Subunit: 421 residues, 3 copies
Amino acid sequence: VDFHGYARSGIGWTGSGGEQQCFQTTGAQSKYRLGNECETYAELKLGQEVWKEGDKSFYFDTNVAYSVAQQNDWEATDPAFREANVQGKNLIEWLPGSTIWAGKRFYQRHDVHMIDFYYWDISGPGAGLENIDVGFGKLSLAATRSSEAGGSSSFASNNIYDYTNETANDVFDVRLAQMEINPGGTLELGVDYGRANLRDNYRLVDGASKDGWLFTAEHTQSVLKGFNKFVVQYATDSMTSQGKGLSQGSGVAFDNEKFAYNINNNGHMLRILDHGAISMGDNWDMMYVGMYQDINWDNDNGTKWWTVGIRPMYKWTPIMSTVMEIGYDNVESQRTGDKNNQYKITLAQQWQAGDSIWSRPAIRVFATYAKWDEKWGYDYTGNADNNANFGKAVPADFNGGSFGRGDSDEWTFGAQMEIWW
Amino acid sequence: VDFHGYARSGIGWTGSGGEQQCFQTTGAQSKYRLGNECETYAELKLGQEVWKEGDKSFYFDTNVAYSVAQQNDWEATDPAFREANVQGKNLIEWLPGSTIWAGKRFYQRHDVHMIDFYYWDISGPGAGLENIDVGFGKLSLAATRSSEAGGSSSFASNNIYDYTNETANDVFDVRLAQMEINPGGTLELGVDYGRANLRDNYRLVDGASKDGWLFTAEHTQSVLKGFNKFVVQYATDSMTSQGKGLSQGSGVAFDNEKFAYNINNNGHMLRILDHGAISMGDNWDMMYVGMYQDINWDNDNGTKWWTVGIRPMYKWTPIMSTVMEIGYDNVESQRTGDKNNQYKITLAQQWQAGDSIWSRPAIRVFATYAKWDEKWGYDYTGNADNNANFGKAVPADFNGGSFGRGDSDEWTFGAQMEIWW
Amino acid sequence: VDFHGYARSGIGWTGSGGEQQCFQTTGAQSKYRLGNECETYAELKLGQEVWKEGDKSFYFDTNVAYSVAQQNDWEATDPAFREANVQGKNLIEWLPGSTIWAGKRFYQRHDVHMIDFYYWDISGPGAGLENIDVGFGKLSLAATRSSEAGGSSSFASNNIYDYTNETANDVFDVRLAQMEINPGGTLELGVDYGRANLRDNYRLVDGASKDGWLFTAEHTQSVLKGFNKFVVQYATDSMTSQGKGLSQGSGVAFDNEKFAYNINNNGHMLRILDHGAISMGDNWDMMYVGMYQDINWDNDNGTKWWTVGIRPMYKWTPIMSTVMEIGYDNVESQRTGDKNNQYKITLAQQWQAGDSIWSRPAIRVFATYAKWDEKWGYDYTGNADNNANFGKAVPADFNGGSFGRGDSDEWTFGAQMEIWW
Ligand SMILES: OC[C@H]1O[C@H](O[C@H]2[C@H](O)[C@@H](O)[C@@H](O[C@H]3[C@H](O)[C@@H](O)[C@@H](O[C@H]4[C@H](O)[C@@H](O)[C@@H](O[C@H]5[C@H](O)[C@@H](O)[C@@H](O)O[C@@H]5CO)O[C@@H]4CO)O[C@@H]3CO)O[C@@H]2CO)[C@H](O)[C@@H](O)[C@@H]1O
Ligand SMILES: OC[C@H]1O[C@H](O[C@H]2[C@H](O)[C@@H](O)[C@@H](O[C@H]3[C@H](O)[C@@H](O)[C@@H](O[C@H]4[C@H](O)[C@@H](O)[C@@H](O[C@H]5[C@H](O)[C@@H](O)[C@@H](O)O[C@@H]5CO)O[C@@H]4CO)O[C@@H]3CO)O[C@@H]2CO)[C@H](O)[C@@H](O)[C@@H]1O
Ligand SMILES: OC[C@H]1O[C@H](O[C@H]2[C@H](O)[C@@H](O)[C@@H](O[C@H]3[C@H](O)[C@@H](O)[C@@H](O[C@H]4[C@H](O)[C@@H](O)[C@@H](O[C@H]5[C@H](O)[C@@H](O)[C@@H](O)O[C@@H]5CO)O[C@@H]4CO)O[C@@H]3CO)O[C@@H]2CO)[C@H](O)[C@@H](O)[C@@H]1O
Ligand SMILES: [Mg+2]
């Protein structure tokens, strides 16, 4: 059996008191991870090539994820069964090197490790013909699925609370990669078309976005013994909320009291990303991100986000180093024009199983410091029924309340382990 | 470690709209599976022979099952811990070749693959001396356990709602197999005696069936490079409801509102089955079932069921074929004499890791069509308290209601993977 | 992948009726296990040495525990994710042979197998530098964590129900082992200091113990081809309730109706233990325990406990024996001076994968008999709100009630499997 996975687990403390806390800018879709992760998360994969004849084989892959809080030993939990697929390589003679897979699978996902942000991920139940050689590049085709909690009505109601039927959304993905636009550089182009797929006779809210498009262009350039990727994405409507390739065309959401509400996503998103890792010499490695994300919605509740951070690693020994991370977020409310921001500065001493910034296991002993100043937050007081600004951006002191994290500081510290295998 | 299991996962669509739907005749205990399974189901076994000395060994087996809906990636769930037993082979000198096992285990279960119907399965916590050589055949002995949700009273009440104590049932199984009644044919005979096993001082409802018997005779005939099994079973009372070897002698059931009710099972069941798989030549494989099940209860709510289906596979290549399934169900209400029926016709193009109809992995791309016409359904409207016909067969339009699936059509299609390893 | 674990699963019956029951003296923190365990419990570990260079390696270990009731096959459950750590051996040059680990881990726990009682176990999320060679012995250092359900107030309230915030507790452990105080004998000394660690601005109840100490001294003496351990421990305050190395400094507990209550643990505990296993000749093995535990609390609700039992095994064959266990408990209420006691006498015929009393797998067929007489129990009638003696020791007939198990008998029997691998 093949055994693979990922896991991070550790123990931390808050400078001001109690267990370790993690810091994330309100409105930001990520946080700088080093010395800023507060769960024990783990995926345990058990796969196995079950049949091979010459060039042909059938591979079987699975994945069961756990995520506990790490405040005790016995921590019962509901594991997510995330993957169970079969990939058949070289089964179509006239489409050599290509795979046909079906099942629940993590499909070609793209992410930025240091902020743990996945920008292109349509994983889920699915099927596809992957890696067809089109000569100048490799062409792939997949259809995956997701489904929103409610959003549909068995009959046409004018009352939003009548749209509580789960609504399946379908994504149809087409990618064209490994095109060498230049020397050292490759270009991948992708098109995603998602749409809410209603049961016969069901209806979505009026004005529900219903569908959308995600367009991706990733350029990878080999550099300094590392790489640099430059991404540019553009989403439309129903693809703006999840913003990674998955569709939410119903536009209905529910509060903790099962009350439906209208998170209308018509609009568009523009994402421009640049990240990579470069080795500069023998004693330094460093990863970096820079991103600007603009979710512009028709309802005016979008956000304009900017992040920048670097993680320079200096190797003392082939298995010991000093890692340092510095991140900065700044999110502006579309509805209110206010701005939230934060800068995190972490310093760690680690031991890796390798001389890379990419080598895992890694055992870290760190200290983190964050200082923020948020001038707006979301109004989640009340009920989707009691409240009418429920789920909206609102100023920090709106109606004499407290919204956002405030303007403060904090420092934490602890030991952690991280490993993909 | 040994790694074994089973898994099926896929993505589907409904001709009329939304995700794939599955079709099963109301009153039928199964449905024709090809292109008609709507969950991601998976069992992951991890066993290991932990000790061996010459002829003697101790094998340790486990099984953890998951079953998600496959409408998203992250799907939290409560896995069933189904097996954790130890089998000791050849530990009793004067009973050579025999095993002594104890633990929770799937014990010698018999099923009909294409309708995924298990007709002889007493699996559960248990213990037994398996495979004793009696000369003309192999004799096995096991005792397993199950327990119904409520059914017992701490004191004698006249009120059914007082019977909410879980009631353990015990099965005592004896099988005599591998007897060669003829050439190419073997005969297995089995006797199952189950009984509700009450705590000291507890009482079961009046008229509760309390116990029962299941009698099995299976004849396997080697044929056409395949086999054909002919089964005949007869159950009595408390063994009629589950009808596979497990006992439910309390006769109390609960509605979703915790209301007790009386699902009295005194009566008997007669099952006559014939299924198998035969290869006819080099280009065809085909499995088939034919069954007639008659659950006749004292309360008149039993059913008389008939199924027939065939799954012919024609091999284009050693690893590619066209599978087709055709199934027909027809269940008649004992209480009302009405009839529900359906015919499913599926057509699929698959790729297997083998030239057999039994070879897995298998990746299918299918289209299914079902057309039904049900004239009765069960009355599950209301409450075990509000309703008095609660849980009874009732005509399709009873009291101006709608019971049963109606008289309709539908077609679906999608891609799926199936694999046992 | 490395595959390890533990598992026990079986089927039992109660002499007087229904499934097997287990017997434990009210007030005792354990019971004699042989033929007296009523769950299917299982830990499945999957680890793997992920990197090795010469003397250096990184080992990755995990653990997922299940515990079902074993009254049916399909038994859904919430598995506990208990371990996910990385151990780096020999990574610190000038501290050779030593390990640095971080993650959630079962750390050097001590237990008495036959009563399944862990007397020194601080496992949980943690980190440490283990096995430093101090010359005369090996010195280890670890910090682990636990957290109580509530116990903290966001503001100073006088009302106990205001202390519902989870309160993290930290343990700081230091051990000094493998010191050879004599020939055949080793000495381990340990010091544990635990303390509730409050969020900035939170408050614990008044008089909450807040912290404490656990002091351990274990002497292992090689004897009769076995060992004998003699333990002496002394806890203080917040370490008295769990009494194994974990801290509970808040002193607030909750009833099943979320009502807070005061389980004040100021006081101390004195534990004097002696257990071991010795082989006496070729045909006998025998394990034994003897313990006296005195939890003396300021609130007068502590207990004074005494246990003694032996498990002599006589080998008929290298793989078959007759095991017998005899245990006696006697707990006296601190609050009421009354006494509860019981004696269990079990007799089993087993088959092991070895000629040891320590060899597993093991398949047992047993019969157990217990006879008790309890003169006090805890008052758990009512509510933390309705009741005021809620959670207190109370006489068997207090206020005309029934508290304690009474004065009775019972016998059970069944087959079971046990295995660590
Ligand atoms: O070798 C073929 C392989 O190559 C490439 O994979 C590499 C990635 O491109 C590269 O970025 C890197 O990926 C790492 C990732 O950086 C690292 O962080 C880790 O990812 C973890 C997250 O850290 C963890 O938080 C968790 O995230 C969850 C999240 O909590 C959950 O809410 C939801 O969003 O799902 C996430 C994922 O389940 O899990 C992820 C891992 O699942 O590990 C990544 C790799 O496993 O390194 C990769 C090689 O090691 C290609 O991208 C890939 O397609 C090729 O197959
Ligand atoms: O080699 C020794 C072995 O031989 C024989 O096993 C073979 C079977 O006789 C033969 O019929 C076939 O069995 C397959 C079965 O046909 C196939 O469908 C699959 O079974 C799955 C179901 O498909 C799946 O739905 C699921 O069913 C659950 C069900 O959802 C749940 O509600 C409840 O009813 O439990 C069921 C089972 O857990 O799971 C089953 C599998 O557990 O796989 C079967 C085999 O694993 O092929 C067998 C050999 O591959 C003997 O019968 C056997 O005793 C001998 O040990
Ligand atoms: O080889 C290096 C190893 O050596 C030593 O380990 C040995 C132990 O010292 C020795 O006593 C023995 O330990 C056994 C134990 O006797 C046996 O009972 C079993 O323990 C099970 C329990 O039986 C089982 O009930 C369960 O207990 C749970 C409990 O239900 C739960 O509520 C909570 O309290 O956690 C408990 C544990 O999770 O699980 C335990 C096992 O986890 O197995 C033990 C060993 O696995 O034999 C050991 C060697 O086989 C050192 O002590 C150890 O540090 C060294 O690493
Ligand atoms: Mg659960």
